[PDB]
Design a protein around this ligand. Sequence first.
Ligand code: HEM
Ligand code: HEM
Lengths: 145, 145
Amino acid sequence: SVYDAAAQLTADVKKDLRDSWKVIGSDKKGNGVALMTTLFADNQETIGYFKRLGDVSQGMANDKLRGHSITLMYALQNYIDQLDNPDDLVCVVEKFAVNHITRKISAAEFGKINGPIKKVLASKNFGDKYANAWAKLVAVVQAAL
Amino acid sequence: SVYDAAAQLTADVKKDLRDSWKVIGSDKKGNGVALMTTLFADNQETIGYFKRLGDVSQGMANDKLRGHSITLMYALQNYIDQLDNPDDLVCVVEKFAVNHITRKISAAEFGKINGPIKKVLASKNFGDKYANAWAKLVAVVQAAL
Ligand code: HEM
Ligand code: HEM
């Protein structure tokens, strides 16, 4: 269950998640856009899903993409803030899951975000230990897809 | 015009929004649900739009409503954080506007949130002065609907 996946996040994992988010979460517009552009660069097959955003090659200049990227970073902010209360983490995770279920995004496809997250983390010197911690949070969302 | 509306956010208005947000934003779950239940209680004709959340009369006990409410407070958090940059404030407002346009929500009905906000603020000892400041921020979203 999603509850089982959340309830398993350990103190060491939450610690790594919070320490790293302190940095990558400080520049939501910059890191959010880089997050999306990297996804499009390494997984071109996903581009079609974001047709509403127009030409995503525009990057920062694309106001629709910029608005989306910033808002996505707040979804991650939401997750990070609910870490110490699985009950709340679960209800928010399930809320965003619906957003993706409606767009026919599978658990496997949603996991494609791990690559970009790993690279964004790396750009700030957060290694594999930190990439692994984030894959665990993403897995909580996958449990709901 | 969303850009003209954004221009209405003067230094004094931005200050009042931040000061009051520091209090209201400290308890997103509690104040978020309070906002929603007050809306449903004072404007029962809007409950139909929230069919997906189930029985909203259950308030806090309703997982979907709680997840929705917390997330809603993060939308307001997003707005507050974009106050320094008008271009970014507009792109996020337009992003959330689409979320409501697709649900057939007009500027007029979106404005029904002013009642709940004034009441939630009043219970925290923030009067009309602060209620009006928030009305201006809400007015920015209305301009995009
Ligand atoms: C860290 C992981 C991710 C987070 C936190 C996240 C968050 C969000 C949020 C907040 C929205 C806006 C929901 C709405 O207003 O309808 C969204 C939309 C969307 N997401 Fe994700 N997402 C993530 C990963 C992904 C991945 C990997 C894919 C695709 C493989 C994906 C596909 C979509 C699509 C198609 C939309 C709709 C975009 C639009 O038309 O506006 N998401 N996501
Ligand atoms: C302070 C003002 C408000 C803010 C910041 C706000 C924010 C949000 C957010 C973030 C969502 C989730 C978007 C999504 O995932 O699709 C949402 C959904 C929604 N909002 Fe609002 N909203 C506000 C006022 C209103 C009002 C006054 C109405 C109704 C008269 C309304 C009707 C809706 C509806 C129908 C949904 C869909 C809920 C669902 O089925 O999940 N909103 N809103």
